[PDB]
């Protein structure tokens, strides 16, 4: 009866790609920018610069000492890496991620921001793309980045570990062994809108995982601040803390009690009389996900004041609302 959410986010070719070799810099940096923009359309569109071989092609690229080179090869392979889990896998085979980990070392800032973005892009594929990413290094970067004073990078940095926390428990793991953890419940009390909605995303994510991953979370201490989001009047960090709790709630009973302990059944409650469906339905999902404990869970629940909210949701006006009120009375 327990719910777990993850979000994920993301002519003559083959000539081309020989015209990168050519020592005419007008010649190589035009055919590049043609390149790149065959690659930022559909998936057919992407499928056809792989079978030219630029893919080769711009992973040597990436040493090179031009900048204005580096740019837009970054910029193709992020184009390259938006499509499809497969045409994602040309881009680990071509060695691109070696590259790419090395280059978040780099003191240039355009550069390292277009980097970033490339490895959001592998990391939004499927688990086999996502284990890459992690075997390739760059989760001891994205971690350190987490204390950068560019709100830009730590942006882009929480960007890629959320996608890599939507992938399985073994990916979760690697997030939290990496020590992700601290830095993000660090950022939870940040006062950017932007980066504590992109730490709210990846613990959610993390929170999605299995017990272990769920007790990570909780041993880290973001469940006092998760509590506190409930209160508060934006809509973006409200949806989030909801998010994140009820996929703490959709472990075990000792991880529902501390939900509990925490004092979340108040503001839970709380926000039932709430005139905005969207807000509504996840406190109801985070209720729902605390009813599906034991009878000491049930029993808070109970006592909170639910019972009473609930059996009068069974009269609202949305049908998603009936039911989910309906569901979370018959566990209790
Ligand atoms: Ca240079
Ligand atoms: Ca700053
Ligand atoms: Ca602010
Ligand atoms: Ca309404
Ligand atoms: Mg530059």
Do not use: C, F, T
Request: cysteine-free; overall charge negative.
């Amino acid at each position: 009866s327990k719910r777990k959410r993850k979000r994920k986010r993301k002519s003559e070719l083959p000539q081309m790609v020989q015209q990168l070799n050519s020592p005419d810099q007008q010649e190589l940096q035009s055919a590049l920018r043609k390149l790149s923009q065959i690659a930022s359309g559909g998936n057919e569109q992407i499928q056809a610069v792989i079978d030219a071989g630029a893919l080769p092609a711009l992973v040597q690229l990436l040493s090179s000492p031009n900048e204005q080179i580096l740019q837009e090869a970054l910029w193709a392979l992020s184009n390259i890496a938006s499509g499809g889990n497969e045409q994602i896998q040309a881009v680990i085979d071509a060695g691109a991620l070696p590259a790419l980990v090395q280059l978040l070392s780099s003191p240039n800032e355009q550069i390292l921001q277009e980097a970033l973005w490339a490895l959001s892009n592998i990391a939004s594929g499927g688990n086999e793309q996502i284990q890459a990413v992690i075997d390739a290094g760059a989760l001891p970067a994205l971690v350190q980045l987490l204390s950068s004073p560019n709100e830009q990078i730590l942006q882009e940095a929480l960007w890629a570990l959320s996608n890599i926390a939507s992938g399985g428990n073994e990916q979760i793991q690697a997030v939290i062994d990496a020590g992700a953890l601290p830095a993000l419940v660090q950022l939870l009390s940040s006062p950017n809108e932007q980066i504590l909605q992109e730490a709210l995303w990846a613990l959610s994510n993390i929170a999605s995982g299995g017990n272990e991953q769920i007790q990570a979370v909780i041993d880290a201490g973001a469940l006092p601040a998760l509590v506190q989001l409930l209160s508060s009047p934006n809509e973006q960090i409200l949806q989030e803390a909801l998010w994140a709790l009820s996929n703490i709630a959709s472990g075990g009973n000792e991880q529902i009690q501390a939900v509990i302990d925490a004092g979340a059944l108040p503001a839970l409650v709380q926000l039932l009389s709430s005139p905005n469906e969207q807000i509504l339905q996840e406190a109801l999902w985070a209720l729902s996900n605390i009813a599906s404990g034991g009878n000491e869970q049930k029993q808070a629940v109970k006592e909170a004041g639910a019972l009473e909210k609930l059996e009068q949701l069974q009269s609202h006006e949305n049908e998603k609302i009936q039911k989910e009120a309906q569901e979370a009375l018959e566990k209790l």
